mmCIF file of C-alpha atoms and ligand atoms in Angstrom:
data_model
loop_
_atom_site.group_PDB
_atom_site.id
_atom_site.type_symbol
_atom_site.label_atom_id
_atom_site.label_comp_id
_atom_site.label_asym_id
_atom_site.label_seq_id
_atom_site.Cartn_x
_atom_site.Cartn_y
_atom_site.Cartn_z
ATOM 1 C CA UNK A 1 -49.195 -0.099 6.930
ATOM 2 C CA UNK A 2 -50.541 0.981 10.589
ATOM 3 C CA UNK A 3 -54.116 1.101 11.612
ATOM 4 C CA UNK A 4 -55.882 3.906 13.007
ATOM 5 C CA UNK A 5 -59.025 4.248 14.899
ATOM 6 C CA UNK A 6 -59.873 7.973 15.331
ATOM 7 C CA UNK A 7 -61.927 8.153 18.114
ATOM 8 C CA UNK A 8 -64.865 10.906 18.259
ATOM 9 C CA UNK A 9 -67.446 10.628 15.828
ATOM 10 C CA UNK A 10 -67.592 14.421 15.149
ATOM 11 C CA UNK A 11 -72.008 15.350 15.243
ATOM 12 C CA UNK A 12 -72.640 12.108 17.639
ATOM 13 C CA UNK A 13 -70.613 11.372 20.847
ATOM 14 C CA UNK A 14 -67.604 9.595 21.451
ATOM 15 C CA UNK A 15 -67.129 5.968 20.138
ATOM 16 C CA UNK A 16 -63.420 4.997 18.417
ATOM 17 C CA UNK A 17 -63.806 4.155 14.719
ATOM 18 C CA UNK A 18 -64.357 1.267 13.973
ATOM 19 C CA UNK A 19 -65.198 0.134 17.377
ATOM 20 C CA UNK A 20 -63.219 -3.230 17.305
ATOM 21 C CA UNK A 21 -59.666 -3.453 14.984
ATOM 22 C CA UNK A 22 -58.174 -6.387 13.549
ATOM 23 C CA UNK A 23 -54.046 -6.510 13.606
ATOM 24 C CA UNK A 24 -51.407 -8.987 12.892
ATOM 25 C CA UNK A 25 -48.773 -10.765 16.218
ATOM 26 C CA UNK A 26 -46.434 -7.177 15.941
ATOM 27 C CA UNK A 27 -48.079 -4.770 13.396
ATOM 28 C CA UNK A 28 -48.563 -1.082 14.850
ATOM 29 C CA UNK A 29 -51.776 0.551 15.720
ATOM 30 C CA UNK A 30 -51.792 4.856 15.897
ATOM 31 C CA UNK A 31 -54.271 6.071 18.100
ATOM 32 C CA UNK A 32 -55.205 9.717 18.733
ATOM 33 C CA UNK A 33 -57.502 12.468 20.165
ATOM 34 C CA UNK A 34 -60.396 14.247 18.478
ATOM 35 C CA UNK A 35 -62.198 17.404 19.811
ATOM 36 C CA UNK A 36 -63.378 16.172 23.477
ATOM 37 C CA UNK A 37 -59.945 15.121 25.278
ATOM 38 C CA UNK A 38 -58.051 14.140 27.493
ATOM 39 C CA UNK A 39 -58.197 10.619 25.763
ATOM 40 C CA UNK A 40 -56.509 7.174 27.811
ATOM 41 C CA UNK A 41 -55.224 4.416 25.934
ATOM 42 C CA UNK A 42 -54.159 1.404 27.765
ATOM 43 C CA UNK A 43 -55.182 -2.483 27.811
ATOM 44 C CA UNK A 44 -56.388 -4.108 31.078
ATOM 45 C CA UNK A 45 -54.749 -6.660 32.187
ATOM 46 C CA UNK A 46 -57.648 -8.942 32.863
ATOM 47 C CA UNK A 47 -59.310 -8.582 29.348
ATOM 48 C CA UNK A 48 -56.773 -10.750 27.341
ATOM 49 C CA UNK A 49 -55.846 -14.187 25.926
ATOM 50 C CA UNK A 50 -52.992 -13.996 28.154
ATOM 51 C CA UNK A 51 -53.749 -11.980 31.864
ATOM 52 C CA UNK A 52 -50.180 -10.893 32.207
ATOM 53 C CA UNK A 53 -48.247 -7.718 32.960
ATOM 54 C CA UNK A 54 -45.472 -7.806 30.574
ATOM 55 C CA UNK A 55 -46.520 -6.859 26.935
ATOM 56 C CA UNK A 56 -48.322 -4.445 28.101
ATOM 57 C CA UNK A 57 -45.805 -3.044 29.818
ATOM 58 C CA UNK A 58 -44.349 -1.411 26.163
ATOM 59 C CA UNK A 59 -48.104 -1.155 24.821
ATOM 60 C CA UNK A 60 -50.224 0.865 27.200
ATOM 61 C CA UNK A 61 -49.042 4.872 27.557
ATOM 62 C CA UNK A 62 -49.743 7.517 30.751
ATOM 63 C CA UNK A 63 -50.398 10.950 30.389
ATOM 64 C CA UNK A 64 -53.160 12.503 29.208
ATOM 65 C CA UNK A 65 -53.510 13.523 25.848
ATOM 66 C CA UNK A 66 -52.266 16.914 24.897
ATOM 67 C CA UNK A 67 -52.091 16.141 21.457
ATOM 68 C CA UNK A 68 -54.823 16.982 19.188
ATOM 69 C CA UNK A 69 -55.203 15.020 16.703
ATOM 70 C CA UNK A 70 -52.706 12.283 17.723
ATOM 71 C CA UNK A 71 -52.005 10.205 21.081
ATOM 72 C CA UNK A 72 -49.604 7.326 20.898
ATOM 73 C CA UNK A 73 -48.422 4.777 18.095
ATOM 74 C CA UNK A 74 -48.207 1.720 20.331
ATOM 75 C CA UNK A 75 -45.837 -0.333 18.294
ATOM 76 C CA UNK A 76 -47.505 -3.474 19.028
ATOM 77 C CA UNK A 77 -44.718 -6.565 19.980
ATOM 78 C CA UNK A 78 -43.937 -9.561 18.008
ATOM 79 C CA UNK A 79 -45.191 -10.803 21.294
ATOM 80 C CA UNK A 80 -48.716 -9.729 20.595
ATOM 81 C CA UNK A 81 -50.543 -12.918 21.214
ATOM 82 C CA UNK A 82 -53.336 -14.168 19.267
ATOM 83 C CA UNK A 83 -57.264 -13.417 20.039
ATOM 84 C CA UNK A 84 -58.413 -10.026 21.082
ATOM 85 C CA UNK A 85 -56.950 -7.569 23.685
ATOM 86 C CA UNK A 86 -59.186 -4.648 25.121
ATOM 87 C CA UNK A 87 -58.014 -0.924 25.668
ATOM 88 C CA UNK A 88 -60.388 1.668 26.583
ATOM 89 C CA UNK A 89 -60.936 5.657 27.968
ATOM 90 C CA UNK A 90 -60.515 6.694 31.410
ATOM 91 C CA UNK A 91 -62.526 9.778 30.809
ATOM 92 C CA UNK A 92 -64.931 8.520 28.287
ATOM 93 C CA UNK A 93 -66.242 5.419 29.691
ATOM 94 C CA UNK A 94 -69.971 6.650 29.160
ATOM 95 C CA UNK A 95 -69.525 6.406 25.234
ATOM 96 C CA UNK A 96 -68.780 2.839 24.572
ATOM 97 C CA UNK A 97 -64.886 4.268 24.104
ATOM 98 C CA UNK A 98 -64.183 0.540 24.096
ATOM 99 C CA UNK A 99 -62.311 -1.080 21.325
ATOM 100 C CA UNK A 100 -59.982 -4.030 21.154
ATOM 101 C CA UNK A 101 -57.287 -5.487 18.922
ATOM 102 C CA UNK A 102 -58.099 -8.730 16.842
ATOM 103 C CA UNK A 103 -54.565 -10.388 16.317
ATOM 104 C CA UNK A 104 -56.168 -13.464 14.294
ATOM 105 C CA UNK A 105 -53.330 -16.789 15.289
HETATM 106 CU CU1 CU Z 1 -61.538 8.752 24.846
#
């Protein structure tokens, strides 16, 4: 199946859940909002096994999140590369909003 990671605890603060994720080289990851948005997904380009700007390119999303409950299913690639990527929260950057992607090789 997918993984998920809601992010927002619910009594605590903001932290996406779990905080790290482990995937496979093209499985899909859903990703959404819970009550304290707008949410930003996206995955720097310096924090990765490969510093490119091409897979990313069909992984990381604009806009804010309008959507309650949901934000973007980022189909991951068969490109994915091996290791550990790194996406994180434009808004909440105070609340260790950082996870990342474990695509063991
Ligand atoms: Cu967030």
């Amino acid at each position: 199946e997918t993984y998920t990671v809601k992010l927002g605890s619910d009594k605590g603060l903001l932290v996406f859940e779990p905080a790290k994720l482990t995937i496979k080289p093209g499985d899909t990851v859903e990703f959404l909002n819970n009550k304290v948005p707008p949410h930003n997904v996206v995955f720097d380009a310096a924090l990765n096994p490969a510093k490119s700007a091409d897979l990313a390119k069909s992984l990381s999303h604009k806009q804010l999140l309008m959507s309650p409950g949901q934000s973007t299913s980022t189909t991951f690639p068969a490109d994915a590369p091996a290791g550990e990527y790194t996406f994180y929260c434009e808004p909440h950057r105070g609340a260790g909003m950082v996870g990342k992607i474990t695509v063991a090789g």
